[PDB]
């Protein structure tokens, strides 16, 4: 679920998902079009694609379980949708951690008109 993803993001990065990642660049929190602005925005682009691989799942609301094996995120077995959603979220949280070194506050509340053109998954 979106709330669980937000908690995962905070655990991983020390940033609150809202507002650090809820309106960032062209793809974080409301992705759709444009060239991603930086590596963090590319995490969101890929995460959006990942959810796109699951048209008959409901990633905003469906809850999954996971645990930590010494820092590592381990998705625990639920329904097929839950497992796949968890793997998408895990990847994005890791990606955000890997790209904290270039996170830029200038991309928070990034305006829609600067995000043009479709980029295929």
């Amino acid at each position: 679920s979106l709330l669980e993803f937000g908690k995962m993001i905070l655990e991983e990065t020390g940033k609150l998902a809202i507002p650090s990642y809820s309106s960032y660049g062209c793809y974080c929190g409301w992705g759709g079009k444009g060239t991603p602005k930086d590596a963090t925005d590319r995490c969101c682009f890929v995460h959006d694609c990942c959810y796109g691989n699951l048209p008959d799942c409901n990633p905003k609301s469906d809850r999954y379980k996971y645990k930590r094996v010494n820092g590592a995120i381990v998705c625990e077995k639920g329904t097929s949708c839950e497992n796949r959603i968890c793997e998408c979220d895990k990847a994005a949280a890791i990606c955000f951690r890997q790209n904290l070194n270039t996170y830029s506050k200038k991309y928070m509340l990034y305006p829609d008109f600067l995000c043009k053109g479709e980029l295929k998954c």
């Binding site: 992705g31 959006d48 694609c49 796109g52 699951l54």
Partner: peptide, 4 residues
Amino acid sequence: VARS
């Protein structure tokens, strides 16, 4: 719901 996927992202697009």
